[PDB]
Amino acid sequence: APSGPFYRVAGMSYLRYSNICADLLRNVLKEPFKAKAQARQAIHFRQAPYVDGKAGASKVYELENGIPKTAN
Amino acid sequence: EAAAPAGPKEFTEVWNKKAPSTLIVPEFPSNYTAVKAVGEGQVHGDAFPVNFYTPHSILSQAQKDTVVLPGVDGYFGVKASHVPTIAQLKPGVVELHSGAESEKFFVSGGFAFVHPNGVTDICVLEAATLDQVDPAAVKSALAAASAAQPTDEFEQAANRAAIELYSALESAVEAKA
Amino acid sequence: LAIADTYKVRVTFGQASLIVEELIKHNPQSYQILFNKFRSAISFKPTVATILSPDLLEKQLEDVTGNSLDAYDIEASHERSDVLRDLTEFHLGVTLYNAMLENNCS
Amino acid sequence: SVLAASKMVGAGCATIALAGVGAGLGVMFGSLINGAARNPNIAKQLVGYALLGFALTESIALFSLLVVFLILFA
Amino acid sequence: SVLAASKMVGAGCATIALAGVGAGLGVMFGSLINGAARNPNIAKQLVGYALLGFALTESIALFSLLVVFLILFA
Amino acid sequence: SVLAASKMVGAGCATIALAGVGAGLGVMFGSLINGAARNPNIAKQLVGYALLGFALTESIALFSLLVVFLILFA
Amino acid sequence: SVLAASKMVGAGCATIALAGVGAGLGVMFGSLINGAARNPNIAKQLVGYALLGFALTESIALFSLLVVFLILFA
Amino acid sequence: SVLAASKMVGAGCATIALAGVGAGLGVMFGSLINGAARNPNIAKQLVGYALLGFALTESIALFSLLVVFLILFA
Amino acid sequence: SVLAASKMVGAGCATIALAGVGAGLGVMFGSLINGAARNPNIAKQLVGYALLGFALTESIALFSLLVVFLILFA
Amino acid sequence: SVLAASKMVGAGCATIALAGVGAGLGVMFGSLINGAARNPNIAKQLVGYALLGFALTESIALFSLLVVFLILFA
Amino acid sequence: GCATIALAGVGAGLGVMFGSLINGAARNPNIAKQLVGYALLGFALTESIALFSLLVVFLILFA
Amino acid sequence: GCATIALAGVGAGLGVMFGSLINGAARNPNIAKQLVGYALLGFALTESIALFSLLVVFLILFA
C-alpha cells in the first residue's frame, strides 16, 4: 500500500527510521562516550488512551536501548 | 491561494475576541528567532552563516565559507550564495571549512536546509565527530548486519539502514585524511 | 490520550518521537503544542507551537501567488510530497522534545 | 537492370528507421525500470504502460517494414 | 528507366526520418512511466497527455510517409 | 532525365530533417508529462506551453517539407 | 545536365540542419515546461528566455535556408 | 561541369554540420531555462553565460559557413 | 577534373564532424549555466573550466579543419 | 584517377568519427563542470579525472586519424 | 572510409562514461579510485568495439 | 564498409551502461558486486548484437 522511500513503504515511519539510525550510531561510539550516549538514548514514559472521557488501558515503555526495532 | 493569511499577527486579533480578556496572547516560536529566510541580507560576502543543529547540542553556530553535506545522491558542497535547497542527508560525514580549519562530523541522517537569504541549517539527529568513533566495532556490527536476514520487511529496512550507515562509516574511517 | 512518567528519568528525543508516533496514529491537519517557555528563572511565557500536516495544509498555506516553497530546490530521494511527509513529522519531533524540555525546566 | 538493383539499395537505407525505433524502445524500457525502482507497489501498472508504449512504437516499426517490403515487392 | 530507380532510392532515403519519430515516441512513453511512478494518483491523466503527445508526434511519421508515398506513386 | 530523376533523391535527402523534429517533439511531450507529475495544479498552463513549443518546433518540419516541395516541383 | 541535377541533390542534403535545430527546439521547449513546473512565479520570465532561445537558434535554420536558396538560385 | 556539380553536392553535404550546432544551441538555451528556474535572482548573470555559450558555439557555425563559401567560391 | 571533384565532395562530407563538436559545446555550456545556477561563488572557476573544455573540445574542431584542408588543399 | 578520387572521398567519410568523439568530449567537460559545481573542494581532483578522460578519449580520435592518413598517403 | 564512422559511437560512449566518472567521483570522494577501477575496465572493455572496427577497416583494405 | 556502422550504436550504448554502472556504484557500493553482475550481463547482451552486426560484415566479405 504505501508509496515512498524504503523505510516508509515498509510501514516504518520517518522518525523511527532516523532514530534507528541514531541508535545504531550510538551503539558504535567509544566506551568513554558510549556512557554519555546512553544518557540520551533511553525511553521511559507511558501512554493511556481515553475513549470514554475517564477510563483506559496503559502501555509502559521502559526501554534503555532506544527506539523499538521490532514492529509497532 | 493563501486564503488564511495566518501567523503571529493574525492570530492575536482573533484571540482578542474569543479568549477571556485578562489573558495576554501566548508567544510564538517565530518570536524567538532573528535569522529570517526571506529577509534580505546575512551573507556579507564569502562567509555565510551555517547553523549545525542537533537535538542535544549546537555543534556549530559559527560561520564557514563552504559546507560539504552528504546528500542522498551523494556528497554536495554548499558555497556562499547557494541555490535554496531542502536536501535530505544520507548518513555520511559533514565538512565545515572556514579556511585552514576543517572539522568532520559523521552524521546519522536528517535534513539540511539552505535558505534564500543564504543561511544554512544542518539538522541531524546524532552527529558524532570522527575521533569518538572506532574503526573496530564497525566490522563486528556490519558483519552481523550482513548476516541476519529476516523475512520481515520492517527489520529488513532497519537492517538495510544498518548496512548503509556502517558502510559509509567504514569508508569514512578507512579514508581518514 | 494521556502521557505520563515522562520526566521520571529525563526527556530524550526517542521519547518525543514515540509520543509523536502515537500522535500520528491520528492523521490530523494541524498539530498544536501548548507549553511554557523558560525565558528566565522569573518569566515562563506560555506559547503555542503549530505544525501543519504536509499534503493537507502545508502546501496550501504556503501557496502565495504560486508557491513560496518552490524557491527551495528539493533534493530528496522521492518527490516533494514525500519529503514534506517526513519533514513535518521531524518538525513535530523537535517541537515536542523542545516543548517538554522547556516545560520541565520551567 | 538498374531498377531491381536500385530497389535493393533503396531497401537498404529504408530500414534504418528501425535504429531510431530501437533507441526509443530501449529508453522506454529503461524508464520502465526506473519507474519500477521508484515504487514497486505500482509496477503491475507500469508494465501496462510500457507495453502500450511498445505497441504504439511498433506502429512506426511496422511502417518502416511496410516501406522496406513495399520497395522490394512493388 | 532511372526515374523508377531514383524514386526507389529516394523513398528509401526518405523514410529514414521515421527513426527520430521512434526515439521521440520512446522518450515520451518512457516519461509517461516515470511520471506515473512519481505520483500514481494522476495515472489516468498522464495517459491522456501521452496519447495526446503520441497522436501529435506521430503526425511527423505520417508526414514522412506522405513524402515516401509521394515520391513512390506520384 | 537526370534532373527529374535526381529531384527524387533530393527530396529523399531533404525529408530526413523530420527525424530531429520527431525526437524534439518526443522530448517536449515527455517533459510535459514529467512536468504534470511535479504539480498537477499547473497542468493547464503546461499544455498551453507545450502547444506553443509544438507550434514553434513544427515550423522546422514545415521548413523541411517546404524545401521538399520546392525541390520536387520547382 | 549534371549541374542542374546536382543542385537538387545538394539542396536535399542541405536541410539536415533542420534535424538538429528541431531537436534543439524540442529540448529547449521541454525544459521550458520543466522550468515552469518548478516555479510558476517566474512563468512569465522563463517564456521570455525561451522565446529568446528560439529566436537565436532560428538563425541556424536561416543559415541553412540561405544555403539551400544560395544553392537553388545561384 | 563535374567541377560545379561536385561543388553543389559538396556544399550541400557540408552544411549538415549545422545540425549539431542547432542541437547544441537548443541544449544550452534549454539549460538556461531551468537554470533560471533554480534561482531567478542570478538570471542576468545566466543570460550572459547563455549568450557567451551561443556566440562561442556559433564559432562552429561560422566555421561551417566558412567551408561552404570556401568550396562554392574557391 | 574528377580528382578535384572528389576532393570537394570529400571536403563537404568531411566538414560534418563539426556537428559533434557543436553538440558537445552546447552540452558543456549548458552545464556551465547549471553550475552557475547552483552556486555562483564558483562561477569564475566554472567559467575557468568551461573555456578550458571549449579549447580542448575545439581540439577536434581544428583536427577536422586540418583534415578538410588536407583533402581540399593538399 | 579513380583511386586518387576514392582516397579523398574515403577520407571525407572517415573523418565522421571525430563528431562522436567531440560530442563525447563535450559531455565529459560538461560533467566536469557539474562535478565542480557539486563539491568544488574536490575540483582539483576532478580536473585530474577530466584530463585523463581527455587523453583517453582523443586516443579514439588519433585512431581515426591514423586511418584518415593511412588511406590517404598510403 | 565509410567503415570508420563506428568510432564515433565509441567516442560518444567513452565521453559519457568518463563524464560519469566525474559525476561518480564528485558524488562520493571516499571511493574516488574504485570508480576509476571500474572506468578503466569500461574503457578497455567497450574498446573491443573499436578493436573490431579497426579490425574490419584493415580486413577490407589489406585483404 | 557501411555495414560496420552498427558498431557505433553498441559502443554508444555500452558507454552509457558502463557509466551508469559507475554512478550506480557511487550511490551505494555495498551492492557493487551485483551492479557489476548486471553490468557484465548487459555487456554480453549488447555484444550479442555487436556480433550480429559482425556476422553480416563477414557475410558480405566472405560470402
Side-chain angles (χ1 to χ4, degrees), chain A, chain B, chain C residues 1-19 21-106, chain D, chain E, chain F, chain G, chain H, chain I, chain J, chain K, chain L:
Chain A
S3 198
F6 84 112
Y7 47 87
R8 188 63 79 167
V9 291
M12 174 184 306
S13 68
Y14 172 63
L15 277 172
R16 190 179 303 254
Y17 151 75
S18 170
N19 282 284
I20 269 179
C21 275
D23 287 13
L24 271 46
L25 181 52
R26 286 188 210 93
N27 283 8
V28 198
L29 313 181
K30 298 312 285 173
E31 290 86 3
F33 296 111
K34 206 191 188 323
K36 293 179 179 179
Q38 208 55 251
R40 71 166 74 99
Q41 210 154 352
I43 293 169
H44 296 93
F45 78 109
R46 55 171 224 273
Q47 48 199 21
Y50 280 166
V51 72
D52 66 329
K54 279 79 58 166
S58 175
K59 179 66 184 303
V60 198
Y61 297 85
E62 60 268 31
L63 295 96
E64 282 255 349
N65 288 173
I67 190 152
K69 301 168 168 44
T70 327
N72 184 66
Chain B
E1 50 265 35
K9 190 258 292 178
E10 206 275 343
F11 187 76
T12 74
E13 294 96 356
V14 171
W15 204 80
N16 293 150
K17 311 305 172 175
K18 277 96 159 182
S21 315
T22 192
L23 290 78
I24 211 164
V25 55
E27 311 273 319
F28 301 108
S30 312
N31 311 132
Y32 293 141
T33 183
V35 198
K36 245 68 179 185
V38 305
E40 54 91 14
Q42 282 278 347
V43 68
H44 74 271
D46 285 276
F48 68 101
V50 43
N51 310 117
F52 204 101
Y53 281 140
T54 310
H56 46 265
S57 157
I58 301 182
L59 291 164
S60 201
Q61 194 183 1
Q63 303 207 331
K64 306 297 158 169
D65 73 338
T66 193
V67 174
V68 161
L69 309 167
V72 295
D73 313 274
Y75 285 66
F76 90 109
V78 189
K79 275 296 176 167
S81 201
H82 195 63
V83 53
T85 287
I86 305 169
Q88 180 155 351
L89 302 186
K90 261 182 53 200
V93 308
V94 183
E95 269 176 30
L96 323 178
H97 304 337
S98 176
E101 298 88 294
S102 67
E103 53 270 23
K104 332 290 203 75
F105 307 99
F106 176 75
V107 302
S108 151
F111 301 95
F113 319 103
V114 183
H115 287 69
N117 54 317
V119 309
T120 311
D121 299 343
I122 312 165
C123 289
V124 284
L125 252 72
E126 181 79 36
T129 182
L130 270 293
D131 50 354
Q132 50 206 26
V133 54
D134 64 278
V138 284
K139 255 83 177 178
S140 42
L142 183 51
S146 198
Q149 318 303 315
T151 60
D152 201 354
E153 55 179 337
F154 200 85
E155 287 89 359
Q156 188 68 260
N159 221 325
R160 183 182 158 162
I163 294 150
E164 61 96 18
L165 170 58
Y166 294 147
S167 175
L169 187 46
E170 278 181 10
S171 180
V173 78
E174 179 262 357
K176 53 211 190 56
Chain C
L1 173 74
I3 291 96
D5 269 314
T6 186
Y7 322 112
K8 198 174 65 66
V9 291
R10 75 196 62 88
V11 177
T12 72
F13 199 85
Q15 192 194 56
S17 50
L18 270 186
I19 294 174
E21 301 292 332
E22 182 53 82
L23 293 185
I24 304 154
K25 304 310 181 59
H26 315 325
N27 42 81
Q29 297 207 2
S30 48
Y31 309 88
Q32 300 211 27
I33 320 295
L34 263 293
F35 67 104
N36 308 265
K37 199 82 169 187
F38 182 81
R39 303 311 287 188
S40 91
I42 292 184
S43 58
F44 324 114
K45 300 206 259 287
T47 53
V48 189
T50 168
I51 313 100
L52 316 175
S53 201
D55 203 3
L56 298 200
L57 296 181
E58 181 157 278
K59 300 217 295 185
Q60 316 178 20
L61 259 294
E62 289 283 345
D63 267 353
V64 47
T65 50
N67 198 316
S68 74
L69 196 46
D70 288 325
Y72 294 88
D73 176 69
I74 318 293
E75 199 188 0
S77 90
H78 289 56
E79 65 175 14
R80 191 181 61 171
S81 72
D82 285 16
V83 78
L84 291 179
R85 187 66 73 181
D86 301 331
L87 203 50
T88 44
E89 272 66 346
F90 194 22
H91 181 45
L92 186 68
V94 50
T95 198
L96 215 49
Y97 177 78
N98 166 71
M100 74 170 46
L101 208 67
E102 298 270 21
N103 163 262
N104 166 78
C105 174
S106 44
Chain D
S1 162
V2 70
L3 78 175
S6 66
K7 277 178 250 201
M8 295 298 164
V9 77
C13 47
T15 169
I16 74 181
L18 288 179
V21 85
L25 271 183
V27 61
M28 190 201 64
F29 280 118
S31 169
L32 158 75
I33 292 166
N34 290 316
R38 280 197 173 264
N39 46 0
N41 305 122
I42 203 195
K44 281 305 176 194
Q45 187 174 358
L46 306 184
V47 178
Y49 291 159
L51 269 293
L52 197 147
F54 160 72
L56 277 310
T57 299
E58 197 87 328
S59 91
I60 307 302
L62 285 200
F63 295 160
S64 184
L65 295 167
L66 173 65
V67 169
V68 82
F69 292 164
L70 195 77
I71 288 179
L72 291 187
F73 318 124
Chain E
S1 88
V2 79
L3 200 72
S6 75
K7 282 206 284 188
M8 296 304 181
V9 58
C13 174
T15 177
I16 303 189
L18 312 184
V21 171
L25 269 174
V27 305
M28 189 197 59
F29 281 136
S31 182
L32 156 75
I33 308 173
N34 171 259
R38 287 310 188 97
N39 46 3
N41 303 113
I42 50 169
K44 191 256 288 180
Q45 199 181 358
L46 315 170
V47 184
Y49 295 153
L51 284 202
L52 195 144
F54 150 76
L56 199 57
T57 201
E58 213 194 15
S59 88
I60 306 181
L62 301 190
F63 280 5
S64 296
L65 284 188
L66 179 140
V67 186
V68 164
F69 295 143
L70 175 86
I71 68 182
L72 265 191
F73 313 122
Chain F
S1 87
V2 79
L3 188 149
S6 94
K7 287 196 305 175
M8 313 292 189
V9 308
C13 275
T15 179
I16 327 164
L18 308 184
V21 178
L25 273 183
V27 78
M28 200 203 60
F29 289 130
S31 96
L32 171 65
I33 303 170
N34 271 31
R38 269 209 183 279
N39 44 351
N41 287 315
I42 205 57
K44 283 85 183 170
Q45 199 197 23
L46 288 188
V47 190
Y49 288 155
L51 288 178
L52 189 136
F54 154 77
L56 265 58
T57 197
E58 196 71 28
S59 282
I60 296 309
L62 302 178
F63 282 157
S64 160
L65 297 186
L66 183 59
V67 173
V68 161
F69 293 151
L70 259 61
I71 281 170
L72 260 174
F73 311 117
Chain G
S1 88
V2 280
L3 193 142
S6 86
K7 190 172 297 305
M8 315 323 266
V9 186
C13 311
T15 42
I16 305 306
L18 303 189
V21 67
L25 269 183
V27 179
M28 198 197 61
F29 286 129
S31 73
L32 159 73
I33 296 178
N34 258 322
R38 196 162 318 251
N39 48 356
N41 301 109
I42 50 163
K44 256 78 176 179
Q45 174 203 23
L46 290 185
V47 191
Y49 296 162
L51 294 199
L52 166 83
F54 158 78
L56 289 178
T57 182
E58 250 204 325
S59 277
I60 312 300
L62 174 139
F63 294 164
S64 176
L65 290 208
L66 261 294
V67 162
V68 80
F69 295 157
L70 195 69
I71 284 303
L72 286 181
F73 304 95
Chain H
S1 165
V2 287
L3 193 140
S6 45
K7 251 148 59 167
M8 293 320 172
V9 168
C13 58
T15 173
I16 73 181
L18 273 80
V21 176
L25 265 189
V27 163
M28 183 277 320
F29 274 130
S31 176
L32 166 69
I33 322 292
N34 82 312
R38 295 285 176 83
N39 44 353
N41 298 117
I42 54 163
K44 299 308 164 188
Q45 196 186 352
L46 296 171
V47 288
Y49 292 137
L51 289 160
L52 182 137
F54 158 73
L56 216 73
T57 199
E58 207 61 32
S59 88
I60 299 305
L62 258 64
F63 280 9
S64 197
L65 275 179
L66 158 73
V67 188
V68 169
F69 281 63
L70 191 138
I71 288 172
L72 267 166
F73 315 130
Chain I
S1 42
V2 283
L3 172 58
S6 95
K7 277 195 282 178
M8 266 189 298
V9 164
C13 173
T15 316
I16 83 164
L18 297 197
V21 73
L25 281 186
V27 75
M28 185 270 294
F29 286 129
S31 276
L32 169 69
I33 298 176
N34 282 135
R38 276 182 63 89
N39 41 355
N41 189 78
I42 313 293
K44 300 184 185 299
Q45 197 171 347
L46 281 176
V47 165
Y49 300 143
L51 306 179
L52 187 134
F54 156 75
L56 309 189
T57 307
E58 283 308 279
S59 94
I60 300 191
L62 67 87
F63 275 175
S64 284
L65 208 44
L66 78 97
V67 162
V68 81
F69 274 21
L70 197 139
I71 313 157
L72 184 55
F73 295 118
Chain J
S1 201
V2 304
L3 186 65
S6 55
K7 291 196 302 177
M8 306 314 105
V9 79
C13 300
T15 173
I16 297 179
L18 312 176
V21 181
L25 277 191
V27 168
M28 187 201 76
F29 276 118
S31 187
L32 168 70
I33 299 182
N34 264 321
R38 272 296 293 243
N39 44 1
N41 301 319
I42 318 297
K44 243 57 174 183
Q45 189 183 0
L46 292 173
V47 188
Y49 288 144
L51 264 295
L52 77 91
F54 170 79
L56 211 50
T57 299
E58 298 275 34
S59 176
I60 293 92
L62 73 89
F63 287 158
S64 82
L65 294 156
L66 77 95
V67 188
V68 84
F69 296 151
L70 178 143
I71 71 176
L72 263 192
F73 291 165
Chain K
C2 319
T4 168
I5 300 178
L7 305 163
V10 179
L14 253 48
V16 78
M17 200 196 50
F18 291 154
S20 276
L21 164 70
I22 304 174
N23 267 317
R27 253 157 169 78
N28 38 357
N30 307 120
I31 206 178
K33 200 261 164 205
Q34 188 201 303
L35 308 187
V36 194
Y38 285 144
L40 301 171
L41 186 137
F43 152 76
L45 194 65
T46 85
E47 212 71 32
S48 89
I49 294 316
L51 184 144
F52 283 149
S53 178
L54 290 164
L55 162 75
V56 163
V57 74
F58 283 145
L59 178 46
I60 302 189
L61 269 167
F62 293 153
Chain L
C2 76
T4 185
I5 307 308
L7 277 306
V10 302
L14 275 193
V16 315
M17 193 201 58
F18 280 138
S20 179
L21 159 73
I22 292 175
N23 271 323
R27 283 189 154 274
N28 45 5
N30 183 284
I31 205 58
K33 298 306 168 185
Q34 278 75 18
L35 315 169
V36 186
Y38 306 140
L40 266 44
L41 183 138
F43 166 73
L45 276 162
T46 298
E47 284 316 290
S48 201
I49 307 308
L51 279 153
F52 270 10
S53 160
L54 292 200
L55 188 136
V56 313
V57 154
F58 289 156
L59 200 48
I60 291 312
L61 297 159
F62 307 136

